[PDB]
Symmetry: C3
Subunit: 287 residues, 3 copies
Amino acid sequence: KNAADIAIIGGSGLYQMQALTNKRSVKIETPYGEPSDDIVLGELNGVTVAFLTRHGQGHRLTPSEVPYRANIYALKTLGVRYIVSVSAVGSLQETLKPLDMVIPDQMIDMTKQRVSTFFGDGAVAHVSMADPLCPEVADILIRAYDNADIADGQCHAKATYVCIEGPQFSTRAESHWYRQMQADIIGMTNMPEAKLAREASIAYATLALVTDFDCWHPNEQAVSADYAIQNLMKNADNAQQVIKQAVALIASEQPKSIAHTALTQALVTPVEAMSAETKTRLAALLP
Amino acid sequence: KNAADIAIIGGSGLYQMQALTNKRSVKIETPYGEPSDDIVLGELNGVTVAFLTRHGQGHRLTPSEVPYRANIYALKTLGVRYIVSVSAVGSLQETLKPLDMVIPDQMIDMTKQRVSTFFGDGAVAHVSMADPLCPEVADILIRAYDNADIADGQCHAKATYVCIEGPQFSTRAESHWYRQMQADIIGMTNMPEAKLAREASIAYATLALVTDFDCWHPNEQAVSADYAIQNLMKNADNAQQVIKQAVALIASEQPKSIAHTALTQALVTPVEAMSAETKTRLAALLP
Amino acid sequence: KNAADIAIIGGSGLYQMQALTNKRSVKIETPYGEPSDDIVLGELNGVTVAFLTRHGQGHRLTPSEVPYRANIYALKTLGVRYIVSVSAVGSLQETLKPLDMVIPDQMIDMTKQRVSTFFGDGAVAHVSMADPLCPEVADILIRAYDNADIADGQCHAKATYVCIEGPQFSTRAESHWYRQMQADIIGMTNMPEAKLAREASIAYATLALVTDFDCWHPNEQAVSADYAIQNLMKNADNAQQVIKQAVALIASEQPKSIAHTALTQALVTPVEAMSAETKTRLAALLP
Ligand SMILES: CCN(CC)c1ccc2c(-c3ccccc3C(=O)O)c3ccc(=[N+](CC)CC)cc-3oc2c1
Ligand SMILES: CCN(CC)c1ccc2c(-c3ccccc3C(=O)O)c3ccc(=[N+](CC)CC)cc-3oc2c1
Ligand SMILES: CCN(CC)c1ccc2c(-c3ccccc3C(=O)O)c3ccc(=[N+](CC)CC)cc-3oc2c1
Ligand SMILES: CCN(CC)c1ccc2c(-c3ccccc3C(=O)O)c3ccc(=[N+](CC)CC)cc-3oc2c1
Ligand SMILES: CCN(CC)c1ccc2c(-c3ccccc3C(=O)O)c3ccc(=[N+](CC)CC)cc-3oc2c1
Ligand SMILES: CCN(CC)c1ccc2c(-c3ccccc3C(=O)O)c3ccc(=[N+](CC)CC)cc-3oc2c1
Ligand SMILES: [Cl-]
Ligand SMILES: [Cl-]
Ligand SMILES: [Cl-]
Ligand SMILES: [Cl-]
Ligand SMILES: [Cl-]
Ligand SMILES: [Cl-]
């Protein structure tokens, strides 16, 4: 009977959602192997939410090895229609400061080595990622931030997230180049997660937590190393207040998302043309 | 006795060449496994042409999983000296409109996960891709287009094709970025096909069929979804007329291509230095 | 008892270091398989240096298949604290001419298919690559060049190296694009080598040998093909004089490098949290 309309995918610094009631863990098997950790289900004011720690318990996974296809497939099997990804990012812009949040509206996928589709091997589909972060969810995030009355920082909307492979932080020349491409924040995880969520017909948007300037800033002075985890911990607690507010808005407003029908004019291979093995592997994504 | 000097690699919307006479299919085994489909051989005015459907019958393959090395190796075994790749593309430029054709002269390889050389594991070679689309074949395509007297659209030469991994269409920020890199059209398939054709000493050029603006255009209005396959079908039939004319010109003119000797000053490992296994795998490419 | 504080990783045209005395070869097993070739140990004026031919004997490896993790791991096991990578590059800038040397201070990793970290599968670490080429070693290289009194060319410092996957040389549009990103030289090998050296806490810098303009120059005239190996051979012999001088300076000056402590605030997984298998695989990199 385990079902949730709304999921939170928690990034660096988010290993649990403390405030959920009647917490219970579910191990979901998928055709893509195991998700990053058992998915936690609980209620935030009677609204059932699924919480998935992207890096697993103890932060055991690097961005490149996160099982993105299992995680999105598992959330699909729970009936999730809305995902909020909560991710630590570096800032590429002077006006986006540590402890600010950013709700990007665009993304550029610079990742190299990640499987970034559920398709292939028997089924062809080409979803549009023109608007890769659902504006109805992004608008909710903006009002959720304001509703949370956060003491530190501000929230910026309409930014571009560039996703890199990792795990190392960027060289200065790479940071300069991402700036020239008009990117605003940098992270390692929201691709291929945004692509996969779209293929799975799930509305997906990102609440980014600015943890520092990328390296385009000479952090050289002895005043940089340990504050950086402490601000990651402060960001994470601010993020929890924002999520509380956002879950409330999604539950009451239930916005229509273009993601919800993304597969239907993108699927090239008719379901009747798929092999038994292909249909079985794609079962939760197909109408 | 199955030999062809000229091959057409057909993209989205091109699953056959109807006009060829004495059609016959050949299954070619290669050291890279099977090509995308049986290669069809037939005569266009007594000129033997090989036709290969890049996506296989029924459009079964996504761009990332096309067996590019098998396809080019197989066409090499038939003695093909000239390839025309016929590919559906998105436009990144206002003046390149749906139903136009584009004959690019440059390419940028943004693909991530494709094996993009026949070399490695026993043999080292570094071919130049400075001019990655043979200008002698591109010039033939331009005159072929004019000779075909196409009713809809115009043909543009001297454009840059950016090849992305796919399968999803680009985000708006990615489209903006490709524009800033001076790319003109976007597709998913002509890399590594152009690199492999060059390593195989085969002259290779692209006839691109504009199927729509990339996403940098708000197709939002209900007036976009189904016309998009119908214009892909119109493009494909216009393309057939162009190919008819181009095969005629290549057959009569037999232009000299720099691709024809591309391997000879690029090969670092002397053939006498290769292992038996390496020589056998590379046999059709070596002098 | 085989130990060296300093290693030279030799690129195209560098298959040995002739001047070392009491040469002896060591085969090092690593958890990442075998290095590119047996590492040669010898003394340059009584200073022990390790010499590793990146492409193996006979130039047998392409850039994509070099075992970068084995090579860096093996040099770590010898106690190497300083690496000079000596690499052939193409120039993207008019003022960087064939036979010049370039000591870059920045790098952009455009490679696609290379394992670019020792981390994952049990251990998470995020080293900063903000300054990816140790300025203390780069400054030594500059003074080493001057000390070597090279007859042909000049040496340029403070350049950006863009690393591409290879093996083909760049299209003109790609060369144009790398110019627009403010890159100065192009090579195929120093990523992921620079990332891995940083994770291994080894100071790493590059002596780049300009072997020609990239393709952004019409080498068309019959005056280009064979001079290109002869200038690669002249570069290589100039490089040996520079290395002689650089080894001397590193040995006497022993500069402190930020690389030397790069792992200590970057490691996320506590050593006590790693599995036996993970600790064993990472043993030489861990404190
Ligand atoms: C030389 C520039 N300095 C070094 C002292 C830094 C320092 C930290 C980062 C971080 C970062 C990551 C985790 C915790 C704190 C930080 C921080 O900054 O202070 C980053 C954290 C994320 C990030 N995004 C880039 C992929 C990925 C999330 C970029 C980051 O860049 C940093 C640069
Ligand atoms: C290799 C990458 N190229 C870039 C254009 C593509 C992209 C899309 C298609 C589509 C297609 C594209 C967008 C949305 C829906 C479809 C679809 O398919 O429904 C197609 C849709 C139908 C189709 N035919 C298969 C024979 C239908 C007769 C072929 C299609 O080919 C495509 C090729
Ligand atoms: C939001 C922007 N709109 C959505 C309604 C579109 C719509 C379609 C495409 C297509 C496309 C692909 C197959 C059939 C028709 C189309 C079309 O456009 O109408 C494309 C087809 C190819 C293409 N190249 C990009 C890789 C690959 C061929 C890009 C395309 O971009 C499209 C954007
Ligand atoms: C790792 C990537 N780097 C970028 C410069 C390269 C690139 C090319 C070569 C070549 C080379 C380059 C272009 C055309 C022909 C050759 C060739 O090789 O014939 C070489 C050609 C000969 C050669 N020697 C092998 C010991 C010949 C003595 C070494 C070569 O090394 C190259 C390295
Ligand atoms: C059309 C442009 N012309 C063709 C005649 C060339 C010619 C050579 C290169 C070389 C190159 C590589 C090995 C030996 C000599 C050369 C050379 O140039 O003359 C290169 C050698 C390295 C290089 N870096 C690019 C990856 C890699 C080392 C780029 C190179 O670009 C070249 C372009
Ligand atoms: C997925 C990519 N994102 C980009 C910011 C990152 C990047 C870094 C961290 C770090 C981190 C970052 C930089 C330097 C040291 C660390 C560290 O870790 O010591 C972390 C350091 C500690 C940590 N906590 C694990 C639960 C400590 C409580 C989490 C960290 O998460 C990171 C995430
Ligand atoms: Cl932790
Ligand atoms: Cl920092
Ligand atoms: Cl179809
Ligand atoms: Cl459309
Ligand atoms: Cl050689
Ligand atoms: Cl040359």
